[PDB]
Ligand binder design. Structure first.
Ligand SMILES: CCCCCCCCCCCCCCCCCC(=O)O[C@H](COC(=O)CCCCCC)COP(=O)(O)OCCN
Ligand SMILES: CC(C)CCC[C@@H](C)[C@H]1CC[C@H]2[C@@H]3CC=C4C[C@@H](OC(=O)CCC(=O)O)CC[C@]4(C)[C@H]3CC[C@]12C
Ligand SMILES: Cc1cccc(COc2ccccc2C(=O)N(CCCN)Cc2cccs2)c1
Ligand SMILES: CCCCCCCCCCC
Ligand SMILES: CCCCCCCCCCC
Ligand code: NA
Ligand code: NA
Lengths: 833, 84, 100, 20
């Protein structure tokens, strides 16, 4: 729709006050009305990165606004960036106008264009990044007389830097006449420009062709205003590597900023020029006190310059002193994206955990109003700052802990389906913090194990309120828990103070004979009995041994005993069931109404509440309910044995088979549910066909459920579709049987069961450490892993060997060596003349 | 905790007989009081292998004991090797 | 590894007085100078100290007198009187076990 | 999803992006 045009033969105020904003940058593309322009894949990329740079910095792009070649391509990339701001101001047998430039200002036109861009270079700006002065860059890529005087009237009149590149007619000439000092090279303009564009010279006079030598040689009077985008730069970020190096040349060669090292820094920080700021600013010949490196640091954090945050820290900057109380609150509401904070609302409400509630409250108390480094780390983790958060992680104190808390915080924010691009990136970043915490902890465990396991259970000083183990189970970090350091820790927490090298049977035979513990039979690590009978392998072995002897005594009570009076056997049957209930109520904490959602732990409570009702029917003294108190004991005897069968089932397949099992358990429960649905519908069909048509009660609703199980434990033409029922009901129920068989397969497999073997054993170790009959009777290590982190960061940094075998340093280290041989060849010719 | 200091304007016996052991090696790091020192990933590695070498051979590392740049980095690698 | 007047006379009073060997490396101000003035025999290179040390650290020379700047040429050239006491940890040694 | 979007008892009752 839009596009403004002004016929023209003082100007700048009629477009910054009436129309639009201010310029942090200003690019000049000069080709002129070249009706042909060979757009390669390279030149299509150079002038597409350039408009993205002008989109980022907010520049004006002055060019000739006619619909030909580059200037129609520059215009159509501008509307591509307004589809996915850029102000492409245009100034111009006959050319047609370009319908893609934002403002039009239409040979005869290249004087008002110069005297405008020479005025914007003249300005003084109180924002003052480039010493004020509004950075002007002039590109050049093609040939002709017009683009030659455009480089002239830029460089000669004022100081805008000019960038050329080696693909074109005369921009390849000046790309060849800059790697040469020949005392201005008075006729090498003729020795160039003819052998690389031979048809333009035989179209005009000699006195103007020599004027082109006068044109070119006054460009080269200042080679600090001439950057060349060379051809071998086959990579991204080479336009901004040339624009910033052109702006750094024109700024630093003002002969006024010798005391102004900071203005060179903020320029080289806005562009991502790390390898230029390291060797031209931080070289210890320049005098800085590392005290004014703080406002430059706060800009390196908010604009996401991760390589500059790392450079400021390794040149001396105490990040603990820098992160004051108000810098964190100029960072959590000023520089916090609201799309993440809106996504932080949905994660806190829909998938709520204990870590998120600390994170949601610590985001809030900074946007409403002490571990400062671990607040900057969460700030750069929530916003998916991929490489800034890797710099702050290396400065934290609890580094294995914060690598797991970040890996949990991202894994919860990637459970939100509000945007699967942000939820796909943060899941990917969480999978490389869990990997970051594996290989840091295997570095900690390759040192002494007593310190690395001191670190697993560190009290966190309220990081999230949990140690590294608790923060890894809730994140379901299967790679952190399947590592051999954590598995060795759990197998020592389960074997207890008994050594794991004694034997397996040697522990069991000490239960049946107590005086074998006091000898040198077991090789544990004065009253070793309180150490033997507190290890949860012995507590589990005694509880199963007690539970079998409880079932062999409940079998004697049921058959031989139980005449009419609850004699001395049946009273202690309450007391053994009472400690099977007293431990359940003391484990009835931490349930959340989801502990009973597994059909083997609600079965435990429903086996006692179906047994307590057997003590109710016991103490009624009538034969009509004494026998009803026996059939509810005999039915409950099978429930107590299936729990023993389930204990033997889990404790034998506690390994690689614990994933196949307990997935097949809920797959057979679904088949038995579908079989119960079919037996109900078979009961209605069998009751509706047979007799007693209308002679009914609530007899029916209690028989139809059970009549097919009593059936388990007129043929006119309907008998043939009765078989088609038994060819359909057999098919849909056998498929549910085979889905139960093979459903464990479909759906890295070592870390799946090692997480489950960890999660089950730590669930049992979180019970009481005393056996069944006796339930009624009841910053020095953070400094160590800071050493272990620096040893680890050396490992991953010197793994750049297959990138060191990429010889891009060796492809160019002999270019300096062949030019060392080149220049000595030339000067020895000058002596013998 | 520890760390002994002596104000000073014949010396060697007051540290090998009263204090500690003999030297199979002896390294001298000279920078002086450069308050700034650009520690690269490379210079962080050269002066971390060096203290491991002095840990292995049992050396003395004479340097300027002030808390700036390299000499505060040389000091903090030394406490990293007494931790590990 | 670094520059300044103090680390230049420290290499001097080591090599000149007794024989401790001295190790430098090519990352720094004047330790890069002597890392560049050892792969060269120019009969003690009487003014290549001026042809070095200026194009690789240009701000320290315009802070002091000339007669002491020429004394730095006298400082550097008596280090190179024995090049068997001068090992250079070069930059392309991208591997472990290069300090030892 | 290619069926009717109304429940069972109520069945009886019934170039700008190419540039992107
Ligand atoms: C009515 C009351 C019925 C009473 C039942 C009588 C019980 C008889 C004893 C049989 C023990 C059950 C075996 C369970 C099992 O196999 O778990 C086995 C234990 O195997 C052994 O201890 C070796 C010899 C056992 C022989 C015991 C006499 C699991 O072995 P483990 O714990 O080492 O490995 C776990 C991960 N695979
Ligand atoms: C007639 C009765 C009283 C004599 C038979 C005694 C067994 C019924 C008891 C004593 C030894 C017990 C076992 C001791 C060792 C095993 C293996 C153990 O599994 C592991 O060691 C896994 C390792 C880990 O979890 O880290 C779990 C308990 C279990 C099955 C116990 C289940 C029941 C057992 C076989
Ligand atoms: C009928 C009934 C009701 C309550 C308690 C019991 C006694 O149950 C045990 C006996 C011996 C050892 C351990 C247990 C026992 O508590 N487990 C079974 C352990 C193996 N899955 C419960 C669980 C622990 C971890 C997850 S589930 C029996
Ligand atoms: C791990 C093998 C354990 C064998 C069982 C030990 C003997 C139990 C019966 C002792 C009376
Ligand atoms: C009409 C009955 C046809 C025979 C059914 C055989 C099913 C066998 C299932 C074994 C898994
Ligand atoms: Na059937
Ligand atoms: Na079947």
């Amino acid at each position: 729709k839009r596009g403004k045009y002004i016929r023209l033969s003082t100007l700048y105020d009629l477009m910054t006050q009436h129309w639009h904003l201010k310029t942090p940058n200003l690019v000049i593309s000069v080709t002129g009305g070249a009706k042909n322009f060979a757009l390669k894949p390279r030149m299509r990329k150079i002038f597409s990165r350039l408009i993205y740079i002008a989109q980022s910095k907010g520049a004006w792009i002055f060019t000739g606004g006619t619909h030909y070649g580059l200037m129609k391509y520059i215009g159509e990339v501008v509307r591509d960036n307004t589809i996915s701001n850029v102000v492409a101001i245009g100034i111009a047998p006959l050319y047609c106008l370009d319908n893609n430039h934002t403002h039009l200002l239409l040979t005869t036109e290249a004087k008002v264009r110069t005297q405008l861009e020479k005025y914007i270079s003249e300005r003084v700006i109180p924002e003052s990044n480039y010493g004020g002065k509004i950075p002007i860059v002039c590109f050049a890529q093609g040939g002709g007389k017009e683009t030659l005087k455009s480089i002239n009237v830029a460089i000669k009149s004022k100081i805008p830097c000019v960038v050329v590149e080696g693909s074109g007619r005369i921009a390849d000439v000046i790309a060849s006449l800059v790697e040469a000092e020949g005392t201005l090279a008075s006729s090498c303009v003729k020795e160039s420009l003819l052998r690389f564009l031979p048809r333009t010279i035989s179209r005009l006079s000699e006195e103007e062709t020599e004027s082109w030598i006068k044109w070119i040689k006054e460009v080269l009077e200042s080679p600090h205003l001439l950057t060349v985008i060379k051809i071998e730069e086959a990579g991204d970020e080479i336009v901004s590597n040339a624009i910033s190096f052109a702006l750094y040349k024109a700024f630093s060669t003002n002969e006024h900023d010798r005391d102004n090292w900071n203005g060179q820094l903020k320029l080289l920080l806005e562009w991502n020029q790390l390898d230029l700021a390291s060797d031209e600013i931080f070289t210890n010949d320049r005098n800085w006190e590392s005290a004014d490196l703080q406002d430059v640091m706060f800009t390196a954090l908010v604009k996401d310059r991760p390589k500059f945050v790392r450079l400021f820290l390794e040149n001396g900057l105490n990040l603990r002193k820098f992160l004051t109380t108000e810098v964190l609150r100029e960072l959590y509401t000023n520089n916090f994206s609201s799309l993440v904070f809106k996504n932080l609302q949905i994660a806190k409400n829909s998938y709520n955990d204990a870590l998120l509630t600390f994170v949601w409250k610590m985001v809030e108390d900074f946007r409403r109003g002490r571990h400062p480094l671990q607040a900057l780390f969460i700030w750069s983790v929530l916003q998916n700052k991929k490489e800034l958060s890797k710099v702050i992680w290396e400065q934290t104190r609890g580094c294995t802990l914060a690598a797991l808390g970040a890996s949990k915080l991202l894994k919860s924010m990637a459970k939100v389906k509000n945007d699967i691009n942000a939820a796909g990136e943060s899941e990917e970043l969480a999978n490389e913090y869990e990997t970051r915490a594996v290989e840091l902890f295997t570095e900690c465990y390759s040192n002494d194990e007593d310190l690395a396991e001191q670190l697993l259970t560190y009290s966190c000083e309220a990081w999230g309120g949990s140690n590294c183990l608790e923060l890894a189970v809730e994140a379901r970090d299967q790679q952190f828990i399947a590592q051999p350091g954590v598995q060795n820790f759990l197998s020592k927490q389960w074997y207890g103070e008994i050594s794991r090298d004694t034997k397996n049977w040697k522990i069991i035979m000490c239960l049946f004979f107590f005086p074998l513990i006091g000898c040198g039979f077991i090789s544990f690590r004065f009253l070793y009995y309180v150490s033997f009978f507190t290890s949860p392998f012995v507590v589990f072995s005694w509880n199963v041994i007690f539970y079998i002897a409880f079932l062999l005594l409940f079998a004697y009570v049921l058959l031989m005993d139980f005449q009419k009076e609850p004699t001395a056997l049946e009273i202690i049957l309450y007391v053994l069931v009472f400690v099977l209930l007293c431990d359940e109520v003391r484990q009835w904490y931490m349930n959340g109404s989801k502990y009973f959602s597994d059909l083997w732990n609600v079965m435990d409570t429903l086996a006692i509440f179906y047994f307590i009702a057997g003590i109710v029917f016991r103490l009624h003294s009538d034969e009509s309910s004494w026998y009803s108190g026996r059939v509810i004991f005999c039915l409950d005897y099978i429930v107590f044995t299936l729990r023993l069968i389930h204990i033997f089932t889990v404790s034998r397949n506690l390994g690689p088979k614990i994933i196949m099992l307990q997935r097949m358990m809920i797959d057979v429960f679904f088949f038995l549910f579908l079989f119960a649905v079919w037996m109900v519908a078979f009961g209605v069909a069998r009751q509706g066909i047979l007799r007693k048509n209308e002679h009914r009660w609530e007899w029916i609703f209690r028989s139809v459920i059970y009549e097919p199980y009593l059936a388990m434990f007129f043929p006119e033409w309907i008998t043939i579709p009765l078989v088609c029922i038994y060819m359909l009901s057999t098919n849909i129920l056998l498929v549910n049987l085979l889905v139960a068989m093979f459903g464990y397969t479909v759906g890295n497999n070592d870390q799946v069961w090692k997480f489950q073997r960890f999660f089950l054993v730590q669930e049992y170790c979180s019970r009481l450490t005393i056996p069944f009959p006796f339930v009624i009777f009841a910053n020095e290590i953070l400094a160590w892993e800071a050493v272990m982190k620096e040893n680890y960061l050396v490992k991953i940094n010197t793994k750049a060997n297959d990138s060191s075998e990429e010889m891009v340093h060796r492809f160019r280290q002999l270019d300096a060596k062949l030019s060392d041989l080149k220049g000595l060849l030339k000067e020895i010719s000058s002596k013998i003349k």
